[PDB]
Design a protein around this ligand. Structure first.
Ligand SMILES: *[C@@H]1O[C@H](CO)[C@@H](O)[C@H](O[C@H]2OC[C@@H](O)[C@H](O[C@H]3OC[C@@H](O)[C@H](O)[C@H]3O)[C@H]2O)[C@H]1O
Ligand SMILES: O=c1ccn([C@@H]2O[C@H](COP(=O)(O)OP(=O)(O)O)[C@@H](O)[C@H]2O)c(=O)[nH]1
Ligand SMILES: [Mn+2]
Lengths: 35, 299
C-alpha cells in the first residue's frame, strides 16, 4: 500500500511524483503537514 | 432435507512471516466460529483468497478451530489470487488508475477490486456472499448478518456500512470546494461520508441483474465520474463503491455502524480534530469490531 497524502492536492499517496505543492488541512504546516 | 449454503469470503495473502496478520486472522476466525450457530441442514462456506504459502498457513490455523463448538457443517474453499487477478483484470483495469496506490495500472493492485466484479468471478450457483476483513472481532452470530439481505430496497445491489473517519471529506476536497452546498463527504446523519469495505453484503444476483451497476463498471463511466468528482484514492474497491455511492446511493443498502465498528483514528490526528467526532460516533450494541489501520481491538 502507500501512506495517505496529508496534502489536499495531488495524488492519494504522500510524495506523489507529479505533485509540487502541498495544501495542508487547516491548522497544519510543513512539506508533510507535520506542525 | 434441502441443504442451505451460506458464503463468506476473506482475503488472506502474503501471510507467511506476517505474524501480525496471522494474529488478526486468529482473532477474527475464532470469534466468528465460537459465536456462529446454524440449523442442521445449513452449511457455512468459508472462502479464502490466498497464494499457495498463505493457503498452508490458513489450513494450519483452521484445523485448530474446526470443527466448530456449535457442531454445524462448515466447508473451506481456497481461490488462487493469481487466477482471480487474471479474471478481474479486463473488468477492473480502467478503474485502477483512480483507486490504486498510486499510478498506473499494476496486476498487484487488481485483487483489491475483487468485490466490484465478484458476481463475474464466483460461479452462478452462489447468489450472495459476505466479504469480510480479517482484522475483525465478531460479537454475535454471523448468521444474523444474512437477514440484512432481506432489507435491500429494489435496485440495491450491495450492503455496506459508512466510513467512520473523514477520509472522504479529505479525498473529495476539490469537489466540495467547487460545490459548497454538497452532502458529498459530510458526516451522517445527513451527509454522505463514503463507505468502509471491511464488511460487504454482495448480492451477486442483484449485481448481475442490474443494468445500472453493469454500466458503472464500463471504462467510460468510471472515467466520467472520477473526472466529475476529481477523485483519486488508493483504497481500491472501497473507493470505487464510495464514488458511485455519491452518484447512485440507490445501489447500496447502508448497514448500521454496529455491523462494522471501525476503531482507526489516523485521520483525527491529520487535520480533522474538529469534525472527527461527527464521523466516528457509533452507538448501539456492537456486532462487529473492526480494528482497522492496525488498531488494537479492546476486550
Ligand atoms: C491514509 O493513510 C493512512 C496511513 O497509511 C491509513 O491508515 C488510512 O487508512 C485508514 O483510514 C481510512 C480507512 O478507510 C482505512 O480502512 C480501510 O482500508 C482499506 C480497506 O481495505 C479496509 O477494509 C478499510 O477498513 C484505514 O486503514 C488512509 O486513508
Ligand atoms: O498483506 C495483506 C494485507 C491485507 N490483507 C487482507 O485485506 C484486509 C486489508 O487490510 P487490513 O484489514 O489489515 O487493514 P485495513 O485495510 O482494515 O486498515 C485485511 O483484513 C486482510 O483480509 C491480506 O490478506 N494480506
Ligand atoms: Mn480491516
Amino acid at each position: 500500500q502507500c501512506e495517505s497524502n496529508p496534502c489536499l492536492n495531488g495524488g492519494s499517496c504522500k510524495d506523489d511524483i507529479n505533485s509540487y505543492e502541498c495544501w495542508c488541512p487547516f491548522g497544519f504546516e510543513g512539506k508533510n503537514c507535520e506542525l | 432435507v434441502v441443504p442451505v449454503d451460506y458464503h463468506l469470503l476473506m482475503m488472506f495473502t502474503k501471510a507467511e512471516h506476517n505474524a501480525p496478520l496471522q494474529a488478526k486472522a486468529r482473532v477474527a476466525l475464532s470469534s466468528l466460529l465460537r459465536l456462529a450457530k446454524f440449523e442442521a441442514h445449513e452449511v457455512l462456506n468459508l472462502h479464502f483468497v490466498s497464494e499457495e504459502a498463505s493457503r498452508e498457513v490458513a489450513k494450519a490455523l483452521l484445523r485448530e478451530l474446526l470443527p466448530p463448538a456449535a457442531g454445524f457443517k462448515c466447508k473451506v474453499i481456497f481461490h488462487d489470487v493469481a487466477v482471480l487477478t487474471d479474471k478481474l483484470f479486463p473488468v477492473v483495469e480502467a478503474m485502477q488508475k483512480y483507486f490504486s496506490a498510486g499510478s498506473g495500472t499494476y496486476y498487484s493492485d487488481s485483487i483489491f477490486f475483487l468485490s466490484v466484479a465478484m458476481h463475474q468471478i464466483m460461479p452462478k450457483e452462489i447468489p450472495r456472499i459476505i466479504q469480510l476483513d480479517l482484522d475483525l472481532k465478531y460479537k454475535t452470530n454471523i448468521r444474523e448478518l444474512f437477514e440484512e439481505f432481506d432489507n435491500f430496497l429494489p435496485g440495491a445491489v450491495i450492503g455496506i456500512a459508512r466510513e467512520m473517519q473523514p477520509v472522504y471529506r479529505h479525498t473529495f476536497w476539490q469537489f466540495r470546494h467547487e460545490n459548497p452546498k454538497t452532502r458529498v463527504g459530510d458526516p451522517p446523519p445527513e451527509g454522505l461520508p463514503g463507505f468502509n469495505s471491511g464488511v460487504m453484503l454482495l448480492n451477486l444476483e442483484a449485481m448481475r441483474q442490474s443494468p445500472l451497476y453493469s454500466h458503472l463498471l464500463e471504462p467510460s463511466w468510471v472515467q466520467q465520474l472520477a473526472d466529475k468528482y476529481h477523485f483519486r484514492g488508493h483504497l481500491g474497491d472501497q473507493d470505487f463503491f464510495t464514488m458511485i455511492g455519491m452518484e447512485h446511493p440507490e445501489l447500496f443498502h447502508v448497514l448500521d455502524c454496529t455491523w462494522n465498528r471501525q476503531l482507526c483514528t489516523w485521520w483525527r490526528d491529520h487535520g480533522y480534530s474538529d469534525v472527527f467526532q461527527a464521523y466516528f460516533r457509533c452507538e448501539g450494541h456492537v456486532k462487529i469490531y473492526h480494528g482497522n489501520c492496525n488498531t488494537p481491538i479492546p476486550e
